[PDB]
Design a protein around this ligand. Structure first.
Ligand SMILES: [Zn+2]
Ligand SMILES: [Zn+2]
Ligand SMILES: [Zn+2]
Lengths: 579, 151, 421, 128, 64, 161, 68
């Protein structure tokens, strides 16, 4: 927010600082010597700095934008499902009428036409998860024999819920035209009593996706997985974590991830190398379990935050690792490109700046992913090939762009702002080329959601203070692509649109209020409201208010920049996008 | 096999794709005629870059993590003379090789910068001593008294 | 002429690499790297204010500049740089970005004793000094210019010690002046000389201070004979001398080995102790076998260079068990040589970059065969082959390690034929 | 090409600068009896012999008749300092000329063939 | 997962807190001590996830 | 026990391998005469008993009580007796069968509810209100949390009584 | 009932052989690997007196009887 933090911090203190007998605020000239009215007296040593118009609030501002864009654009917008226990009425079973409607509505052609569409389209995701789709086609065939049975085997119940998770993922990437052609739009809105004029992109495609997730749940609740741990729970949870559900529900997915990690560590299996005396069955089991566990670590990372108490990733991709690099770079490539970003993010919330040697080592291994994704094969028509290709291309460009964002913020290396501008437009052009058929659901993975979450945050945020030409040209395509995101995201999409609106009105708020000099402490509503709202969401994360209800029926007890601050606090309030 | 360089000057330089491989930013943009913005570097500096790519596009290049072939890498005497240029515009050459991730040209210019910085006379180093802040003047007097018998 | 502050304009990523590419010859008064002198047909066959400089400044510096008494032109040019160059702002920015990057720049500051003072020193790779600063002076203007919040920069813990730079009595006085301040947690590492079982009193004086540092890594030795006495374990730890302090053996991170002949001239390059290292590096040993070592617990990087002779882990014998084939089939029949796209990304043109068969071996007894190769390593990743010579077996690197170029061969002309498994 | 690496890799640089001091003094000494004439000399023509080496060691190292620097040869310890320095630098000059010999072995000198065991005997004599 | 989601760190009361909170630090440290007891006395391979993390009678239970 | 050459050449009480002053004097395999053929002396009393610890965790603590076997492809799900295991035993347990159980813990088990919830009479607020809440059918999530809280103590008061 | 055997030092007994398989087979019941290969589904999870009285006491005093 506000300190002095100006350009060209000098080398040696002057006489006035030696008189001053405090910390050497070795700026041009000092925030403390200017506070004593002796600004020029600290200037008079040698090479009297430069123009006093370099926006000295801006580095402090970007330091607090780190505080924001950590605690808002992952934590505040997505990872606070601030709901209630008293104000939420109970649901004892309530899916013997609801999930059984999905027992009703599911058809065999409605199963297999999703199944065969998602075969070459999504043939890396389940291939990363489980492998073969024909065994899964066999489970859908026997599933109509395993449909309304009486001898519900626990294992077979996991197989039943497995294909509900598969149907969830098939909804998550099928376009709406084939969805309305394979399924029917109307019996959902018959059963719910909702509107008939609701072609699936208008809200209920992702709801039916969540209903298939919920019917996986309704059988997994019957699987008794807390007394029956197995790997398919974790596999289907990978498949469900591919959806928007971890962002639309952080807390439930946290506990399910907790049970999945407990399930894995029940096995006490770590290494993934088929040694001399190993079973070939155990060999292939370890080979599969490798990608399983690294996708599990990827699921551990995306939900990580203050609602994530139990951690899994305990390794470093550079420089106390557990099984690191004893592993063939095939889909742990997908993990390692994520763990690349993971080690960046132990410096987002904490304002301690990482060593730039580390960041340039990251700049070195950046191109290793860039040209190991080029080290794959290529298939024009197999949609999983270009699908996985664009996934990894997007991930390395995403971490690249965020890395150059970190370069500009933490140290401001050469031309890193223009690097941000360049990689932003390259990624957005990749989205534009995937505005097509066969590639609209290259735009449905939550990586593009969280990526545009950062882009429309910071490009608008730098548009606030620097009315730049390239930032304006990018801001046009920001406002275009914000409306032109796919409907597979839904509620957080509209929360993102409100966030874009509130940041534009935050720009107007900077436009209407001049920044008050008070020696070197600057004052604006942009400062104080963003000071407050993060702490509001932290007090929501201070879950004592959800435990004050747990320890009985107890009830607790807990100027110009006081007015317009507290006018914009409810004018464009954050409470629209908490939930 | 040709891409277009559109600089901050916007002078469209349609160069070869093998020229584009040296710029690892642009070689990544190959995964994204084929235009891209360079909003800071002027196109004469870019033309110097392109002519270096013409010269050493076919040349062989080290692992860029070395010591022997990184720090003790010998210069090109052709690209010594080719970069016997303005001091100022040489820094724009440096910024161009940074901004487009052109590492052996960056090191090649960098070593010539290292040549020009080293070997400067202790006359002018005595003279250009505290141009920047660099010392309290008490220590400046102490240094000048430290060699007082000859200086 | 040159404009310094104009170079101080353009930022730190640029300004790093220049000091990374002006290594030690910051001065003009620097000698030649002696192979130009070797690759030649000419020997150098060589005034009075500089005679006054020899008269006055030089008797401080007849400890180090006395090595350079050839070419007295360089001598009489030297002391003028020894006035003002070693306070110039470029040098101070170099130390700023260097201690920012912690030896990623030009490195190896060294506790000297000149000005009869025990200040620090910077040597080049020709061991020529340039700068003599005391730790007060070094903490004063360049540490505390950037000691804003990071307390590890308030710490200064990356400095070698180098007995055999100086006299053993100067080792004695050096640790005496080390004692008077808290400079135990200031040094980074210690070096060794010997330039039978009788440790030198310099090294004894070294060991008897060695544990009290508590911030110690990065230890290097330089004599094979010395190597035998101090860390080539030989089954000896219950000794009054000759022991190198188990507690500070735990404290190190990495071991460097300068120049030797063999490691298992004895039975083994043994490190029963030395648990917590992560990186051993072989600089100029003549002969190695791989399995000449005890292979301590988890030393992830293992780089090496300038070798005469490498055997291998001779995995080639062990690969004759898992798929149980002929050697001539193993070259001819059992090489697919797929080099799909990442192989051509780096150069590595001289080594023949092979690959085993995905057809003739069929996803069992292949990952088994890969884990056979893994068994030779015992949890290490980084390999990094510089200037090398004369392996005795095929080059065998697992694809998991070979991907991301965790192994990085730099020089390959005395060698070829890498079968990447 | 054949030897130049392990020519350089024979030594630490400190030792190489010591030798570049020492045998330069040797060559200047040969020119002070004009044994090689004259500002540079090749690596191919250089005079190296055992008695040349030893007579350099005479005329510089041990022969302190030298009435400018005549008079430091009496003390039980300071002259013991003097000749401990002399036997150490004796070995150092031996290494310098051995290395210069090995330099001119690959640098095509018929006049570089040493009989080092004579020099061993010299060392052993001064040692005794 | 649940108890650490409430961010329970201190087990002794503090003066600048909610008295509901500062008393709930002991009134959930008792929960923490019985949680440590169930964490410890169920020492098994089927229980991999541990919680060691290190009035006048409930802390005394977890002491022994 | 001291080994063979400790009893033969009479050296120090040295259980080294083989000794610290006999291997050096040229008797390595000569001083390993310390401990199919048979033996019945107490040499196992050092040699064995630490294997007992391997028994003591994995068989007594793990194997006898904690090692659990299931049958995934045969066990029914919870769709069979969805609510009926819960509902029948909620309808049988009446106010005597709640509070007369709870008065065991109120008299006999003071450290437990102080170790978990504090007071049992504070819980009697909910358990008294449970008979205004057993009859409730549209609860909240909090009220069901109270339900499963007090039915855990209803569970506990069965066993120790 | 059995004389204690060895090879000179390493004592062998039916008690000793059975105290091995007490821990081995029960920890093999604690091996959840082939339960995970059940989770793999179609991938099939496959897995003197010292000689014979071991077979007596193991079969009669059946150590797997503590799994109910
Ligand atoms: Zn000041
Ligand atoms: Zn001031
Ligand atoms: Zn004994």
């Amino acid at each position: 927010m506000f300190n002095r933090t100006t350009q060209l911090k000098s080398k040696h203190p002057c006489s006035v600082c030696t008189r001053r007998k405090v910390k050497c605020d070795r700026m041009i000239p000092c925030g403390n010597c200017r506070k004593r009215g002796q600004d020029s007296e600290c200037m008079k040593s040698t090479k009297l700095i430069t123009a006093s118009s370099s926006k000295e609030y801006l580095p402090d501002l970007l330091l607090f934008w780190q505080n924001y864009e950590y605690w808002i654009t992952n934590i505040g917008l997505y990872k606070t499902k601030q709901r209630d226990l008293t104000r939420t009425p109970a649901n004892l079973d309530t899916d013997t009428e609801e999930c059984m409607f999905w027992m009703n509505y599911l058809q065999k052609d409605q199963s297999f036409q999703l199944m065969n569409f998602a075969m070459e389209n999504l043939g890396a995701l389940y291939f990363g998860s489980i492998g073969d789709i024909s065994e899964l086609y066999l489970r859908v065939e026997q599933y109509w024999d395993r449909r309304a049975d009486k001898n519900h085997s626990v294992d077979g119940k996991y197989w039943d819920a497995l294909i509900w998770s598969v149907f969830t993922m098939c909804i998550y990437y099928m376009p709406v035209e084939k969805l309305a052609e394979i399924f029917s739009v109307y019996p959902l809105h018959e059963y719910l009593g909702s509107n008939k004029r609701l072609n699936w992109e208008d809200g209920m495609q992702l709801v039916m996706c969540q209903n298939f997730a919920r019917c996986s749940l309704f059988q997994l609740k019957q699987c008794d997985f807390m007394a029956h741990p197995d790997i398919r729970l974790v596999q289907a949870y990978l498949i469900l974590a591919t959806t928007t559900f971890p962002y639309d529900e952080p807390l439930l997915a946290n506990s399910l991830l907790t049970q999945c990690i407990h399930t894995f560590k029940n096995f006490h299996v770590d290494d993934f190398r088929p040694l001399l005396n190993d079973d070939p069955v155990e060999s292939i089991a370890k080979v599969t379990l490798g990608r399983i566990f690294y996708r599990l670590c990827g699921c551990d990372y995306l939900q990580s935050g203050p609602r994530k108490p139990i951690a899994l990733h305990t390794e470093v991709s550079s420089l106390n690792v557990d099984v690191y690099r004893e592993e063939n770079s095939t889909e742990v490539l997908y993990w390692k490109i994520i763990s690349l970003d993971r080690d960046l993010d132990q410096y987002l919330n904490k304002s301690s700046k990482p060593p730039l040697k580390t960041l340039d080592a990251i700049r070195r291994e950046l191109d290793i992913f860039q040209y190991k994704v080029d080290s794959l094969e290529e298939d024009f028509r197999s949609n999983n090939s270009r699908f996985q290709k664009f996934i990894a291309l997007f991930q390395i460009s995403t971490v690249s762009w965020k890395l150059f964002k970190m370069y500009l913020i933490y140290y401001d290396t050469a031309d890193s702002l223009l690097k941000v501008i360049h990689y932003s437009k390259v990624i957005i052009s990749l989205i534009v080329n995937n505005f097509h058929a066969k590639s609209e659901f290259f735009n449905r993975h939550p990586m593009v959601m969280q990526t545009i979450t950062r882009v429309v945050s910071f490009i608008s945020f730098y548009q606030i203070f620097v009315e730049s030409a390239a930032v304006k040209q990018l801001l046009v395509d920001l406002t275009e692509l914000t409306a032109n995101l796919p409907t597979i995201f839904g509620s957080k999409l509209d929360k993102l649109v409100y966030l874009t609106e509130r940041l534009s009105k935050l720009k107007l708020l900077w436009d209407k209020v001049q920044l008050l000099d008070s020696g070197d402490s600057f004052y604006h509503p942009v400062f104080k409201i963003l000071q407050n709202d993060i702490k509001i969401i932290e007090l929501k994360n201070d879950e004592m208010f959800s435990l004050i209800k747990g320890l009985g029926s107890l009830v607790p007890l807990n100027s110009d920049f006081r007015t317009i601050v507290e006018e914009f606090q409810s004018e464009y309030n954050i409470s629209d996008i908490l939930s | 096999s040709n891409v277009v360089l559109v600089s901050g000057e916007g002078e469209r330089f349609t160069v070869d794709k093998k020229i584009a491989e040296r710029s690892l930013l642009l070689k990544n943009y190959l995964n994204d005629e084929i235009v891209m913005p360079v909003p800071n570097v002027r196109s004469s500096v870019l033309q110097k870059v392109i002519e270096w790519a013409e010269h050493h596009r076919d040349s062989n290049f080290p692992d860029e993590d070395d010591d022997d072939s990184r720090k003790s890498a010998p210069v090109d005497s052709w690209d010594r003379e080719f970069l016997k240029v303005d001091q100022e515009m040489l820094y724009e050459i440096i910024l161009a090789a940074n901004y487009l991730n052109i590492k052996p040209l960056l090191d090649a210019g960098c070593k010539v910068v290292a040549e020009m910085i080293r070997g400067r006379s202790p006359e002018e180093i005595r003279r250009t001593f505290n141009i920047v802040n660099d010392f309290t003047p008490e220590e400046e007097a102490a240094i000048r008294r430290e060699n007082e018998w000859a200086e | 002429s040159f404009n310094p502050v104009r170079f101080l304009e353009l930022p730190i990523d640029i300004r790093k690499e220049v000091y990374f590419h002006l290594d030690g010859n910051f001065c003009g008064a620097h000698p030649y790297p002696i192979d130009i002198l070797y690759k030649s047909n000419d020997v150098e066959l060589p005034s009075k204010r500089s005679k006054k400089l020899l008269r006055y400044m030089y008797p401080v510096f007849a400890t180090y500049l006395n090595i350079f008494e050839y070419s007295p032109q360089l001598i009489e040019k030297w002391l003028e740089y020894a006035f003002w160059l070693r306070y110039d702002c470029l040098v101070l920015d170099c130390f700023k970005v260097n201690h920012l990057y912690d030896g990623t720049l030009i490195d190896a500051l060294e506790w000297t004793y000149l000005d009869n003072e025990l200040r620090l020193a910077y040597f080049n790779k020709a061991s020529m000094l340039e700068v003599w600063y005391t730790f007060k002076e070094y903490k004063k203007w360049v540490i505390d210019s950037v000691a804003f919040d990071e307390l590890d920069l308030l710490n200064v813990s990356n400095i070698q010690f180098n007995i055999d730079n100086l006299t053993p009595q100067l080792v004695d006085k050096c640790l005496s002046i080390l004692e008077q301040k808290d400079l135990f947690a200031t040094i980074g590492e210690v070096q060794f000389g010997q330039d039978n079982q009788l440790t030198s009193i310099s090294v004894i004086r070294t060991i008897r201070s060695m544990e009290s540092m508590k911030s110690l890594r990065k230890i290097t030795v330089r004599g094979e004979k010395l190597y035998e006495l101090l860390i080539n374990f030989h089954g000896f730890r219950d000794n009054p001398g000759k022991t190198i302090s188990y507690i500070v053996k735990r404290r190190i991170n990495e071991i460097r080995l300068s120049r030797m002949n063999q490691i298992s001239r004895t039975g083994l390059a043994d490190f029963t102790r030395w648990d917590n290292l992560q990186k051993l590096v072989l600089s100029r040993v003549a002969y190695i076998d791989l399995n000449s070592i005890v292979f301590p617990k988890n030393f992830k990087s293992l780089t090496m260079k300038r070798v005469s002779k490498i055997k291998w882990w001779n995995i080639e014998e062990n690969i004759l068990k898992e798929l149980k084939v002929d050697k001539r089939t193993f070259k001819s029949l059992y090489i697919k040589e797929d080099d799909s796209k990442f192989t051509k990304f780096f150069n590595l043109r001289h080594t023949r970059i092979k690959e085993l068969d995905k057809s003739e071996i069929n996803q069992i007894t292949y990952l088994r065969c890969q884990a056979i190769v893994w068994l030779s390593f015992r949890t290490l990743n980084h390999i990094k082959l510089q200037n090398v010579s004369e392996v005795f077996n095929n080059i065998i690197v697992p694809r998991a390690l070979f991907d991301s170029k965790r192994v990085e061969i730099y020089r390959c002309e005395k060698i070829s034929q890498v079968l990447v498994i | 090409e054949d030897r130049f690496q392990e020519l350089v890799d024979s030594l630490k640089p400190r030792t190489a600068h010591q030798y570049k001091t020492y045998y330069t003094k040797y060559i200047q000494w040969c020119q002070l009896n004009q044994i090689i004439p004259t500002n540079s000399v090749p690596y191919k023509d250089l005079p190296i012999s055992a008695e040349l080496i030893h007579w350099f060691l005479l005329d510089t190292l041990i022969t302190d008749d030298k009435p400018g620097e005549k008079r430091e040869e009496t003390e039980d310890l300071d002259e013991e300092e003097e000749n401990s320095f002399k036997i150490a630098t004796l070995k150092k000059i031996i290494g310098s000329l051995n290395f210069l010999s090995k330099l001119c072995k690959v640098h095509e000198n018929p006049n570089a063939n040493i009989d080092t065991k004579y020099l061993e005997s010299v060392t052993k004599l001064h040692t005794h």
